[PDB]
Design an enzyme around this catalytic site. Structure first.
Site, mmCIF file in Angstrom:
data_model
loop_
_atom_site.group_PDB
_atom_site.id
_atom_site.type_symbol
_atom_site.label_atom_id
_atom_site.label_comp_id
_atom_site.label_asym_id
_atom_site.label_seq_id
_atom_site.Cartn_x
_atom_site.Cartn_y
_atom_site.Cartn_z
ATOM 1 N N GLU A 35 0.637 -1.404 0.014
ATOM 2 C CA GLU A 35 0.094 0.040 -0.331
ATOM 3 C C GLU A 35 0.342 1.054 -0.236
ATOM 4 O O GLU A 35 0.655 2.412 -0.618
ATOM 5 C CB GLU A 35 -1.202 -0.263 1.099
ATOM 6 N N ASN A 46 -7.690 9.002 -5.992
ATOM 7 C CA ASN A 46 -8.471 7.866 -6.289
ATOM 8 C C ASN A 46 -9.443 8.645 -7.401
ATOM 9 O O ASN A 46 -9.578 9.704 -7.270
ATOM 10 C CB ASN A 46 -9.340 7.542 -5.110
ATOM 11 N N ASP A 48 -12.491 8.505 -7.567
ATOM 12 C CA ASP A 48 -13.594 9.149 -7.569
ATOM 13 C C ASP A 48 -13.673 10.248 -6.561
ATOM 14 O O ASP A 48 -14.640 11.112 -6.606
ATOM 15 C CB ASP A 48 -14.736 8.030 -6.709
ATOM 16 N N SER A 50 -11.882 10.880 -4.132
ATOM 17 C CA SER A 50 -11.425 11.046 -2.925
ATOM 18 C C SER A 50 -9.645 10.538 -2.190
ATOM 19 O O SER A 50 -8.860 10.150 -3.730
ATOM 20 C CB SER A 50 -11.823 9.517 -1.868
ATOM 21 N N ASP A 52 -5.893 8.552 -0.420
ATOM 22 C CA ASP A 52 -5.649 7.467 0.531
ATOM 23 C C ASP A 52 -4.461 7.572 1.086
ATOM 24 O O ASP A 52 -3.601 8.022 0.469
ATOM 25 C CB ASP A 52 -5.667 6.167 -0.809
ATOM 26 N N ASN A 59 -9.148 5.154 2.986
ATOM 27 C CA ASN A 59 -9.882 6.468 2.302
ATOM 28 C C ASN A 59 -10.387 7.597 2.938
ATOM 29 O O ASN A 59 -11.067 6.986 4.045
ATOM 30 C CB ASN A 59 -10.459 4.962 1.538
ATOM 31 N N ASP A 101 -15.429 -4.019 9.676
ATOM 32 C CA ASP A 101 -16.734 -4.134 9.604
ATOM 33 C C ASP A 101 -17.173 -4.815 7.715
ATOM 34 O O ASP A 101 -18.522 -4.325 7.351
ATOM 35 C CB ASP A 101 -16.356 -2.957 8.471
#
Ligand SMILES: [Cl-]
Ligand SMILES: [Cl-]
Ligand SMILES: [Cl-]
Length: 128
Positions: A35, A46, A48, A50, A52, A59, A101
């Protein structure tokens, strides 16, 4: 801060990640390697909109506030800059919320594609 492999391993173990939700220490170290290359300062945008952040590339869509991700939540209730600290507490605390989650460590694309099903204990071989 760019951690050494064994230095990060020891820090993650001190903060409770070893077998957290069933995932051995090597899973988290493998995850951090692909990562961020162990760099607490890593950021990646990202498509979209967003971003990281940090050693585990958490995110801004869901988990932290960076003030520029419309319609986002801040489920770890922290600024994304806190995930960039040479101190990994915020990142580790937030990673525990993510991995709990429902989807486990499949929440990290790099883990699913480059660590899952591999000999992850090799990432902690030879460390104290
Ligand atoms: Cl904030
Ligand atoms: Cl799981
Ligand atoms: Cl290795």
């Amino acid at each position: 801060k760019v951690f050494g492999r064994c230095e990060l391993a020891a820090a993650m173990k001190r903060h409770g990640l070893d077998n957290y939700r069933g995932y051995s220490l090597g899973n988290w170290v493998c995850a951090a390697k692909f990562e961020s290359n162990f760099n607490t300062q890593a950021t990646n945008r990202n498509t979209d909109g967003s971003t990281d952040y940090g050693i585990l590339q958490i995110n801004s869509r869901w988990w932290c506030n960076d003030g520029r991700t419309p319609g986002s939540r801040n489920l770890c209730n922290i600024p994304c800059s806190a995930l960039l600290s040479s101190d990994i507490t915020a990142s580790v605390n937030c990673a525990k919320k993510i991995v709990s989650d429902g989807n486990g460590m499949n929440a990290w694309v790099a883990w699913r594609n480059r660590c899952k099903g591999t000999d992850v204990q090799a990432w902690i071989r030879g460390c104290r």
